[PDB]
């Protein structure tokens, strides 16, 4: 079977983030409604030297009573609430409690942070995550 669910994460005052390379912000936890708890994690200035040009974005399995397999998709919502710049795992990945999977090079900082592209209305970054858990 499959259980599909989503979480929308609004990061307020995004331009004010002081996170340096490798520093992370995690979201509140979410679930399908569920013994599992997930959260999102973003590195606004990338995870590492290779990704310092990018936001790195991950799905974390926070609490899980030995393993689960899950496909995931992350996107950015524009001002109209439409999904843009989506990236989706080509397959399901194996999560254990405390394990994350994601995209180290999710979106170019030079793109997201340029006001002309309009993806930070009211200085808010809105990310949307869809997860499909294999049961």
């Amino acid at each position: 079977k499959v259980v599909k669910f989503s979480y929308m994460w609004t990061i307020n005052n995004f331009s004010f983030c002081r996170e340096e390379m490798g520093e992370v912000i995690k979201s509140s936890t979410f679930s399908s409604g569920d013994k599992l708890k997930w959260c999102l994690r973003v590195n606004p200035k990338g995870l590492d030297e290779e990704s310092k040009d990018y936001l790195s974005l991950y799905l974390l399995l926070v609490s899980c009573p030995s393993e689960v397999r899950a496909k995931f998709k992350f996107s950015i919502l524009n001002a109209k609430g439409e999904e843009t710049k989506a990236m989706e795992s080509q397959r399901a990945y194996r999560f254990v409690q405390g394990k994350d999977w994601g995209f180290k090079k999710f979106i170019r900082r030079g793109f997201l942070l340029d006001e002309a592209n309009g993806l930070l209305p009211d200085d808010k970054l809105t990310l949307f995550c869809e997860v499909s858990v294999v049961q």
Binding site: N43, Y58, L60, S89, Q90, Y93, G102, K104
Partner: peptide, 7 residues
């Protein structure tokens, strides 16, 4: 897209 882990 390249999927990886930070944990």
């Amino acid at each position: 897209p390249d999927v990886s882990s930070s944990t």
